[PDB]
Amino acid sequence: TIDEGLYSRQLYVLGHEAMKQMSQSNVLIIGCKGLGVEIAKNVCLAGVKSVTLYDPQPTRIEDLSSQYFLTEDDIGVPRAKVTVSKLAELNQYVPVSVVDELSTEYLKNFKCVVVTETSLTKQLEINDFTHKNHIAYIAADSRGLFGSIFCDFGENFICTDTDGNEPLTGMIASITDDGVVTMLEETRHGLENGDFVKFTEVKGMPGLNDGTPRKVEVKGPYTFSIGSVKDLGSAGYNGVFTQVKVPTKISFKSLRESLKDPEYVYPDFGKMMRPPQYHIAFQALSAFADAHEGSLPRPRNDIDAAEFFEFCKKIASTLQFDVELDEKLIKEISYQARGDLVAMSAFLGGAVAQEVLKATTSKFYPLKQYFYFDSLESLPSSVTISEETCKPRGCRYDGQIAVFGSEFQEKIASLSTFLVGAGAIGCEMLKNWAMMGVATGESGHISVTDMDSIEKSNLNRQFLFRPRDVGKLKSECASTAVSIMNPSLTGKITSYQERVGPESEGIFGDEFFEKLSLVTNALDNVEARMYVDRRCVFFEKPLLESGTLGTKGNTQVVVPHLTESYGSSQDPPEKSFPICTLKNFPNRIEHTIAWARDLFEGLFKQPIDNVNMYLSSPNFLETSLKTSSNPREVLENIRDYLVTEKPLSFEECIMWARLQFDKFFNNNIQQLLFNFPKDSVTSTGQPFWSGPKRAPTPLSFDIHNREHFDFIVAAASLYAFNYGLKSETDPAIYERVLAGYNPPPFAPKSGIANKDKQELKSIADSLPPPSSLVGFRLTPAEFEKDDDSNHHIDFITAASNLRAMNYDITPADRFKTKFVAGKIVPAMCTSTAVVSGLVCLELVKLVDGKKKIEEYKNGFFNLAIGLFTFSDPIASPKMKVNGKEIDKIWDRYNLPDCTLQELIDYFQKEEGLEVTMLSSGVSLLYANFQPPKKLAERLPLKISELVEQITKKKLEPFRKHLVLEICCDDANGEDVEVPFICIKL
Amino acid sequence: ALKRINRELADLGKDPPSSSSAGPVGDDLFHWQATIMGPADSPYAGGVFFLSIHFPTDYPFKPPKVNFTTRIYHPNINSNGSICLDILRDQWSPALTISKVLLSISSLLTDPNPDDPLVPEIAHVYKTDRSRYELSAREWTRKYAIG
Numbered sequence A: 001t002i003d004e005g006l007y008s009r010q011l012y013v014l015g016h017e018a019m020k021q022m023s024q025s026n027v028l029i030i031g032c033k034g035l036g037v038e039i040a041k042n043v044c045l046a047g048v049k050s051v052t053l054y055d056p057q058p059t060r061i062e063d064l065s066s067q068y069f070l071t072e073d074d075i076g077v078p079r080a081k082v083t084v085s086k087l088a089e090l091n092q093y094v095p096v097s098v099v100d101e102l103s104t105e106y107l108k109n110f111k112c113v114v115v116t117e118t119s120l121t122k123q124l125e126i127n128d129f130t131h132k133n134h135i136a137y138i139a140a141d142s143r144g145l146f147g148s149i150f151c152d153f154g155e156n157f158i159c160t161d162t163d164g165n166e167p168l169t170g171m172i173a174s175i176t177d178d179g180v181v182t183m184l185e186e187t188r189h190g191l192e193n194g195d196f197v198k199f200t201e202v203k204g205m206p207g208l209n210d211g212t213p214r215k216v217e218v219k220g221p222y223t224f225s226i227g228s229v230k231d232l233g234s235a236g237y238n239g240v241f242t243q244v245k246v247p248t249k250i251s252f253k254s255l256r257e258s259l260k261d262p263e264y265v266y267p268d269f270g271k272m273m274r275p276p277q278y279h280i281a282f283q284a285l286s287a288f289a290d291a292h293e294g295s296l297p298r299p300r301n302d303i304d305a306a307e308f309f310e311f312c313k314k315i316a317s318t319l320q321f322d323v324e325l326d327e328k329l330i331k332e333i334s335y336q337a338r339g340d341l342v343a344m345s346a347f348l349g350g351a352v353a354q355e356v357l358k359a360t361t362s363k364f365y366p367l368k369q370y371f372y373f374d375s376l377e378s379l380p381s382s383v384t385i386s387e388e389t390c391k392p393r394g395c396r397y398d399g400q401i402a403v404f405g406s407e408f409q410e411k412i413a414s415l416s417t418f419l420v421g422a423g424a425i426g427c428e429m430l431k432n433w434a435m436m437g438v439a440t441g442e443s444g445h446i447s448v449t450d451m452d453s454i455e456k457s458n459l460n461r462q463f464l465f466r467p468r469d470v471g472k473l474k475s476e477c478a479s480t481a482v483s484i485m486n487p488s489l490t491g492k493i494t495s496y497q498e499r500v501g502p503e504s505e506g507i508f509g510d511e512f513f514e515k516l517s518l519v520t521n522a523l524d525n526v527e528a529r530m531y532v533d534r535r536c537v538f539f540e541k542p543l544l545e546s547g548t549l550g551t552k553g554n555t556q557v558v559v560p561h562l563t564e565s566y567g568s569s570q571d572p573p574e575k576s577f578p579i580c581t582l583k584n585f586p587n588r589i590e591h592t593i594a595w596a597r598d599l600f601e602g603l604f605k606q607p608i609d610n611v612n613m614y615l616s617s618p619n620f621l622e623t624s625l626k627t628s629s630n631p632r633e634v635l636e637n638i639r640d641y642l643v644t645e646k647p648l649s650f651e652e653c654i655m656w657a658r659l660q661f662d663k664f665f666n667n668n669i670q671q672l673l674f675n676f677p678k679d680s681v682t683s684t685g686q687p688f689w690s691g692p693k694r695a696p697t698p699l700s701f702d703i704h705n706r707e708h709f710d711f712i713v714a715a716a717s718l719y720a721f722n723y724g725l726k727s728e729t730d731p732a733i734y735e736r737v738l739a740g741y742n743p744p745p746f747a748p749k750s751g752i753a754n755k756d757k758q759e760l761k762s763i764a765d766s767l768p769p770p771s772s773l774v775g776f777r778l779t780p781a782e783f784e785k786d787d788d789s790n791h792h793i794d795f796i797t798a799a800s801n802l803r804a805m806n807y808d809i810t811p812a813d814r815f816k817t818k819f820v821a822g823k824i825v826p827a828m829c830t831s832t833a834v835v836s837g838l839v840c841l842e843l844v845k846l847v848d849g850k851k852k853i854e855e856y857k858n859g860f861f862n863l864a865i866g867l868f869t870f871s872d873p874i875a876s877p878k879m880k881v882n883g884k885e886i887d888k889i890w891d892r893y894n895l896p897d898c899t900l901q902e903l904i905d906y907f908q909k910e911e912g913l914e915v916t917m918l919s920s921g922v923s924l925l926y927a928n929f930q931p932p933k934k935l936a937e938r939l940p941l942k943i944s945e946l947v948e949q950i951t952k953k954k955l956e957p958f959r960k961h962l963v964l965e966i967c968c969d970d971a972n973g974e975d976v977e978v979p980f981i982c983i984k985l
Numbered sequence B: 001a002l003k004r005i006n007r008e009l010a011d012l013g014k015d016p017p018s019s020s021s022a023g024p025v026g027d028d029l030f031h032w033q034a035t036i037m038g039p040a041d042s043p044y045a046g047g048v049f050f051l052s053i054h055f056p057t058d059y060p061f062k063p064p065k066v067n068f069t070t071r072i073y074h075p076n077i078n079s080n081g082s083i084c085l086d087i088l089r090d091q092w093s094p095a096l097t098i099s100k101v102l103l104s105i106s107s108l109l110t111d112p113n114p115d116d117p118l119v120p121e122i123a124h125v126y127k128t129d130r131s132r133y134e135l136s137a138r139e140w141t142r143k144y145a146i147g
């Protein structure tokens, strides 16, 4: 019943059972400020059964510092009543309500209770009831640059998945009678001691196929032991083992009991003595609020700081905490008590929403129990922060001014950023910039570029879009939405529809890139990331990269002249299977899926393109005869798709589908078995179909079978679409037409003048002339996974399952086929929120212009296990050139537009280096091993003229520089690396 | 990338491979037209085979793409010229020169590997009727690999 057209990406993270259990849970949220609204948004997008809000406090202006569903026309109205209407639109399956008053018994109606902006006494009163009634209780708090999370899911929490990883599966070479199991060649199982596994498709030991879990004894990186298997058999040949995961019982402690003896979670290992400080500090904040009618300490006030420290001392004495309080840090917590940032709110909202999903679905390992976080390194130091500058000014930025001050607000308001991409991270980044007030001054500006269009599956984690916006450009919708959120950004945002790449240099040129202040990436492919990194390196602009994958996320910051660039780090490459494995000898479902995709492309895409090009290009045949690798194949495809096998109705399409079934699942296997019989042996006497090779078996077409019928339907529908006919789905027509089919006789064949040319000429003279068919075009089938009515994934699944039946491989359903064929990347809204929060916390460091490399942090996190880590950026490598210090990445040579000979002489004289190779991009301009005549012809030419002559392409009018890569040798003959040359045209 | 390619090209220039001659197409450093000479003690004796080499962007951290152009009757080479070679898929390391790859391809030409073929019919003919395989290889290398 799960709408897989909307939760497509989330299901690959959670699953069908997890979401089905999640759609039956009620969540109550107390407090509707920035953190509360963020949690509510993430929960609503997640897909819980319902959400209830409770916040009777009337709105104030400063509450807009992080609440993006509030407007200045709502001042004086309770926050819940003005937030419910805007929250109800995020998801149509998640009703949102508001309760006027909250009685304790009412809490029995919900599955999870989230508490924010609530005093300690009320939290204790609520928890004393939600603990003994087995209701999950999550309490969050955000004070300035500090945050706290507390989780309590009862004393008998049952966790099914504890790490978020899929069960470990592997293919077995053989199993002895002593329980020793070995993987295939050079394959590591990766199991640990004490795990449980089950065996399937094991030959010789059918008893082990039941699935009863067995103990695992790791005997090595490639072998392990399971015990005694004497009774069931003596030896097992082949098979697949799958890990079995057992539930874990986690027992939480109530808030009242855990106040005295807390259990901490450390978000960073460089500072592990702080959480004991924050535990006292937050309780002191609550006590101070209770002692002054709920009013937190004023920003940067010394008297309130002293009183807060007295309260901290009293609390520490009362609770028998043997910890020496840190006056500086505690008073810092006091100063930023009234702060309210959107980056901290986004980070904690993502974390708490993930905790809510953990509580509802009984999946992943939750926080146990306290999580205290701080980003105090983001506090500016180049401006004046004091009581005079941090006082509120009666504006919507008070929650930020109380932390950073008015001067830093002016610094933020004059930014000129550039956001690449408008995905989920792009939407969150734009929201954060709108809330922070980025580029709201006279000299500020924002630019966002993206060339994709909104789809239904994107609405699950991109909250700036609506179902009515499907099909429109992302950048325009995002800019309009964020202008609505913050009216001051009206006219300060420019949205492009251009793909960032080599062809867009006419728009994103030197003039555009010389006015920016920073560049933020929200992309999803490595190529565009590398290109943007190179452009930033050339123009010396700070860059902010951020990526997500399911529940994992990372953020990196690149600073000019300080840290290394994005391209300095290399990631593991994608895995490509051997051609011989896909063509003849598959052994996994991925191989069959790849083969099915190739079959789809070669059946419904390439012949159509050849036919269309023949009917468009006047001289296609002659060029194809002497250019194409298989001109005979092209001619046969044209003949088959024009004359020989041109359908006239749907019955002929069904006949062709049956013919292709026989041709690809019955005859090719027969030929392969004829070439390599099942009893054949290698040159060494070993059996052939052994180990990584499985003996196939031809398929006989049984109409009553489901897979055969599915393949026939899909192939007939795709062929009819190619010829623009009308497809049908009733089984009656298929059964009737396929009943009267006579399979042509087939037998394997051993093989054994200008006749070939005359054969080609016979094919050619049979082709109808191009002029006879004018305006007749065939529609190629462009693969589209996201559409469910185009018969693409259905055909791929059917073909993959049929080939798996050929080679006795376990078939996969349409879910896994769609996941594999489409290269779908799992994604979550919570991960997006967290990465946006981290990026925006680094942005305030970038604005302040911090110089030391110890003040920046690259972040990594995994929400399936509650892991957060931060490490300093890697410094840019240095080098010695002519006895001088040179930065390897952020240095260049600036030279005029001189002749090649003058350039060589300059390098010989000024740098004392001999130039041995000079290239411009992918063209070799000059080399020391070229013949003298060519050099003498090229030496007296200017660099621009030389480049134009070599590349056979005139320089564009907007071109203003040339980047030259030069390899030069020293006087002794030793190669020395030098930075690139920036020729100024 | 570019520096490594230039180093390899200079090394090829200094030492003539005799049996091989690789060089960039036109002036593009990411497209080479390599030449291989048929081994003497092989059915492909007296034949010249031209190969297309495309270097990846992340070279040498990724293996190059090598495709035959002259038609060859070999068990491990199909009609499109694709090569079933170990040092081009997983055994590639950022230490092997293009001369090493050309030598490996020459060795593969010297003696095929029918145990794990790419064109089953050719491998079957090789394993069953060796003389017919020799005749077919000589006919193909005379029709296509000469002139």
Ligand SMILES: Nc1ncnc2c1ncn2[C@@H]1O[C@H](COP(=O)(O)OP(=O)(O)OP(=O)(O)O)[C@@H](O)[C@H]1O
Binding pocket: A009, A420, A421, A422, A423, A424, A425, A449, A450, A451, A452, A457, A458, A474, A498, A499, A500, A501, A522, A523, A524, A525, A528, A825, A827
């Ligand atoms: N070279 C590029 N220049 C500009 N924008 C780009 C470039 N490459 C990708 N993008 C944009 O980056 C965004 C990537 O976001 P995301 O991956 O979340 O969305 P998607 O790819 O459309 O969705 P999904 O992966 O869930 O099918 C998309 O808007 C894509 O258009």
Ligand SMILES: [Mg+2]
Binding pocket: A452, A453, A455
């Ligand atoms: Mg898209």
Ligand SMILES: [Mg+2]
Binding pocket: A524, A825
């Ligand atoms: Mg994407």
